[PDB]
Design a protein around this ligand. Structure first.
Ligand SMILES: [Cl-]
Length: 529
C-alpha cells in the first residue's frame, strides 16, 4: 500500500519472550513460522537506551530487571541469542546495532513475575567471565524435547557442577546419572565426554546462546526407537513425507508415509508393506521421471541407492510422490520371468495363441509343463507334449526337454509350437519306422503355407497307406485330396513320385550318414489355399 513520508526512517523490532521457547521440538529456540512476537515500529536513528527504557514500560517491568539478547545468525546456519551491552552501547542507534537487519529479532530475558514478588531479581552478567547457556531435556520414552530454561554460569565452571541444576529443571531426583550433548547445529549433537573440566574446554567455541541437551542414563532408553538426543536430531534432520500411488489404480490420490532420506530399498519397501498388510517381496516400485509426472522406470529389488537418491529431482515446491504395484509373486521371480509367446496346436488340429511365463533360466521341460497345466488334451491320447520350431511354414526343429530356454531364438521370424505327441509317434520301431516333416507348398518348393506336421512312415509301406494317414489328419473333401501332388524335398532338389507306385524306403528321407546338423529331407504337399 501507500508508504508514509518518513516510513523509510523506521525499522521493525521483533521481541521474542522465553515462553515461545517452550514446546519447541526442533533445532535452535523456536520455529520462525510458529513463533509469536511483540512488534515495535522504531526510528532507525533512535538509541538503544531509549528502546530499553520504552520497552520496559510497555512490557510492564523495571528497566534493571530485563536484559536484551539480539537473535543472531551464526556462520553454521543457526540463529541464537547473542550478548548486548546496554551500559556500553546504550547511545548507539538501533540500525547500527542491528547491522542493517530489518526486521531485527531480540530475545527478552525477564525475571518470573511470580518469583519477583518473592524477592527475586535479575542477576548481574559479567560479559568477560560468564556465559548464558540454554538447557533442553530429551525424553527417549515420548521421543521429545522439554525446555529447561537458561543459566548464567562462569566459563570456568566445571560441567559436573551443572548437573544438580539440570536434574532440578527436568524434575529428576538428585544424583541421577545424565548423558550430556551440545546441540551444535542440525545433524550435529556432540556428546560431552568429561564432566570434570570447565565449560570453555568441554564445548567447542563456547559462546552465549549455546545449547546443552541432556537425558537420563537409563537402561530403558534402549527400549526406545530413538534412545539418544543424538539419534533424535539425526531422525529429525533426515525425516521426509512421501505419497505412494498404485500405478494400476487410475487417479489414485495415494497415502502419505513418513520415511527417512537415508533409508535403503528394503527399509522403504518394509514400511510401505506394513501400511498395505502385504509382504515387501510382493511389491514393485518405480523411479521418478524428473520433468514429467507419473511412474518412471521399474526399480530393481537390489537397488543400492537411498530414498534421497530417488527424491532428488523434486523441486522445493513439488510434492514428493512414488509409484508402486502389488504383485501376486515374489519380486525376484517376477523380474526373472520370461514372456514366452507360442502357438498351442489342440486335438482338433487348430492353432491357439498362448503366452507362457517360465523363468528365463529354465529349460524346454518347464515351458511344456506350464502348457500341460493350461490345456485339455486328446480324448484318450499320450498326455506327452513336444516343442517344435517353425520358420517359413516348415518345421526346422524338435527341441529336447533338457534344452535351456535361453538357447531358443528371440527373433520374430521363429514360430514355436507346443502339441501332444500322437499315440503312433510316442515309441516308434527305431529299426523300420521314421518321423518325417511334412509341409504344404503352392507350385514352387519355396512357396510354403499352412500348418506343417510330423508324420510316421514305415519301411516298405504302400504309399496309399501314407496318403490315407495324411487325409485322416487334414480332414477335407475326398475330391479336394485327389488334386494333391506328393514329392520328396532336400536342398532345393525335389522329385515327385507316383501314388500307385507304393515305393517307401527310409533311406530316401534320411540325410547323409553322420550329418544331423544339415536340414533333413522332408515331404512336400502341392496344392493351393
Ligand atoms: Cl536429509
Amino acid at each position: 500500500g501507500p508508504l508514509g513520508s518518513e516510513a523509510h526512517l523506521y525499522m521493525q523490532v521483533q521481541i521474542v519472550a522465553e515462553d515461545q521457547f517452550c514446546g519447541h521440538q526442533g533445532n535452535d529456540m523456536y520455529d520462525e513460522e510458529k513463533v509469536k512476537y511483540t512488534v515495535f515500529k522504531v526510528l532507525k536513528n533512535s538509541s538503544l537506551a531509549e528502546f530499553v527504557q520504552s520497552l520496559s514500560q510497555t512490557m510492564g517491568f523495571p528497566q534493571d530487571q530485563i536484559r536484551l539478547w539480539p537473535m543472531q545468525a551464526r556462520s553454521n546456519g543457526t540463529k541464537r541469542p547473542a550478548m548486548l551491552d546496554n551500559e556500553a552501547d546504550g547511545n548507539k542507534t538501533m540500525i547500527e546495532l542491528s547491522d542493517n537487519e530489518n526486521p531485527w529479532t531480540i530475545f527478552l530475558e525477564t525475571v518470573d513475575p511470580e518469583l519477583a514478588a518473592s524477592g527475586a531479581t535479575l542477576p548481574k552478567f559479567d560479559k568477560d567471565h560468564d556465559v548464558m547457556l540454554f538447557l533442553k531435556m530429551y525424553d527417549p520414552k515420548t521421543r521429545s524435547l522439554n525446555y529447561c530454561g537458561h543459566i548464567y554460569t562462569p566459563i570456568s565452571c566445571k560441567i559436573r557442577d551443572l548437573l544438580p541444576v539440570m536434574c532440578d529443571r527436568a524434575g529428576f531426583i538428585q544424583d541421577t546419572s545424565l548423558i550430556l550433548y551440545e546441540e551444535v547445529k542440525p545433524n550435529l549433537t556432540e556428546r560431552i565426554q568429561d564432566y570434570d573440566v570447565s565449560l570453555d574446554k568441554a564445548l567447542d567455541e563456547l559462546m552465549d546462546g549455546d545449547i546443552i541437551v541432556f537425558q537420563k542414563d537409563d537402561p530403558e532408553n534402549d527400549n526406545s526407537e530413538l534412545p539418544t538426543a543424538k539419534e533424535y536430531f539425526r531422525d529429525l534432520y533426515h525425516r521426509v513425507d512421501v505419497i505412494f500411488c498404485d500405478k494400476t489404480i487410475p487417479n489414485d490420490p495415494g497415502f502419505v508415509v513418513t520415511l527417512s532420506n537415508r533409508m535403503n530399498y528394503f527399509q522403504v519397501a518394509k514400511t510401505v508393506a506394513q501400511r498395505l498388510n502385504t509382504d515387501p517381496m510382493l511389491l514393485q516400485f518405480f523411479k521418478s521421471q524428473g520433468y514429467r509426472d507419473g511412474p518412471g522406470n521399474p526399480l530393481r529389488h537390489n537397488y543400492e541407492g537411498t530414498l534421497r537418491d530417488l527424491l532428488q529431482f523434486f523441486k522445493p515446491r513439488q510434492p514428493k510422490k512414488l509409484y508402486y504395484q502389488q504383485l501376486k509373486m515374489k519380486i525376484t521371480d517376477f523380474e526373472n520371468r520370461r514372456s514366452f509367446k507360442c502357438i498351442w496346436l489342440n486335438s482338433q488340429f487348430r492353432e491357439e495363441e498362448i503366452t507362457l511365463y517360465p523363468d528365463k533360466h529354465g529349460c524346454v521341460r518347464d515351458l511344456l509343463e506350464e502348457c500341460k497345466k493350461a490345456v485339455e488334451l486328446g480324448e484318450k491320447a499320450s498326455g506327452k507334449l513336444r516343442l517344435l520350431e517353425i520358420v517359413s511354414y516348415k518345421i526346422i526343429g524338435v527341441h529336447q526337454e533338457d534344452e535351456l530356454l535361453e538357447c531358443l531364438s528371440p527373433a520374430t521370424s521363429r514360430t514355436f509350437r507346443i502339441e501332444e505327441i500322437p499315440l503312433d509317434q510316442v515309441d516308434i520301431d527305431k529299426e523300420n519306422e521314421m518321423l518325417v516333416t511334412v509341409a504344404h507348398f503352392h507350385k514352387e518348393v519355396f512357396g510354403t503355407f499352412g500348418i506343417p506336421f510330423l508324420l510316421r512312415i514305415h519301411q516298405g509301406e504302400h504309399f496309399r497307406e501314407v496318403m490315407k494317414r495324411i487325409q485322416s489328419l487334414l480332414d477335407i473333401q475326398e475330391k479336394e485330396f485327389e488334386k494333391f501332388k506328393f514329392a520328396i524335398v532336400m536342398m532345393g532338389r525335389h522329385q515327385y513320385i507316383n501314388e500307385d507306385e507304393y515305393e517307401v524306403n527310409l533311406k530316401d528321407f534320411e540325410p547323409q550318414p553322420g550329418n544331423m546338423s544339415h536340414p533333413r529331407p522332408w515331404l512336400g504337399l502341392d496344392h493351393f489355399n
